[PDB]
Design a protein around this ligand. Structure first.
Ligand SMILES: NC(=O)C1=CN([C@@H]2O[C@H](COP(=O)(O)OP(=O)(O)OC[C@H]3O[C@@H](n4cnc5c(N)ncnc54)[C@H](OP(=O)(O)O)[C@@H]3O)[C@@H](O)[C@H]2O)C=CC1
Ligand code: NA
Ligand SMILES: [Zn+2]
Length: 178
């Protein structure tokens, strides 16, 4: 259908899949606010209009964080959306540190659409950490998240100047470069 209808299909799908989940801020914000915010970063700041990229951004956490399967994504949204979502889906069969390390290792080799989603996802989470230290976190755990995110984003450059410039500003504010 129209761009709008296609976006609302993905937004409503993600809202239902994430309905019982909450972010780790003290207030426990509904999890769906994150994928919506990531996708809005892409339209409002990055100038993105590719509906496949924007659908993937709304859905980028459904397979990683819920029972949703990659085949279910393709079933409702097609193969280009499914391939994007797969690219940004951590292998939850792996230990946390290996997932953290693979994001650094696999950042340069991702498709342009996956780099856009990865950049916007990092930008949302770093803004969130600045806004509110998550429940149970120390201030130096926040800094270290930034130190790791900088290593990932280093591998994502050459994709979108607006997002990369915004990330560079946040990293610089905490003494981190590129
Ligand atoms: N320095 C320290 O004091 C400590 C550091 N650590 C380190 O932290 C890691 C812990 O791993 P893990 O259990 O995955 O915890 P994470 O460090 O992975 O938690 C951060 C993740 O939570 C999601 N998230 C949910 N709510 C928020 C929010 N309000 N703001 C930002 N992000 C949010 C984001 O993922 P998404 O975008 O997918 O929602 C984000 O990537 C280990 O790698 C360990 O080395 C661990 C213990 C102490
Ligand atoms: Na994690
Ligand atoms: Zn995310």
């Amino acid at each position: 259908g129209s761009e709008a209808a296609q976006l609302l299909e993905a937004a409503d799908f993600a809202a239902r899949k994430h309905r019982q989940q909450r972010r780790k801020d003290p207030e426990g914000t509904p999890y769906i606010n994150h994928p919506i915010g990531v996708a809005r970063i892409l339209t409002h700041e990055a100038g993105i209009t590719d509906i496949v990229v924007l659908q993937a951004a709304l859905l980028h956490d459904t397979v990683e964080k819920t029972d949703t399967t990659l085949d279910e994504v393709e079933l409702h949204f097609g193969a280009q959306v499914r391939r994007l979502v797969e690219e940004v889906t951590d292998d939850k069969t792996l230990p946390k540190l290996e997932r953290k390390r693979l994001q650094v290792e696999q950042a340069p080799h991702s498709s342009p659409g996956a780099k856009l989603v990865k950049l916007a996802d990092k930008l949302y989470n770093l803004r969130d950490l600045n806004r509110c230290t998550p429940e149970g976190w120390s201030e130096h755990r926040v800094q270290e998240y930034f130190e790791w995110a900088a290593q990932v984003v280093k591998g994502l450059q050459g994709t979108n100047r607006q997002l990369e410039e915004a990330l560079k500003h946040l990293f610089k504010q905490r003494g981190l470069t590129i």
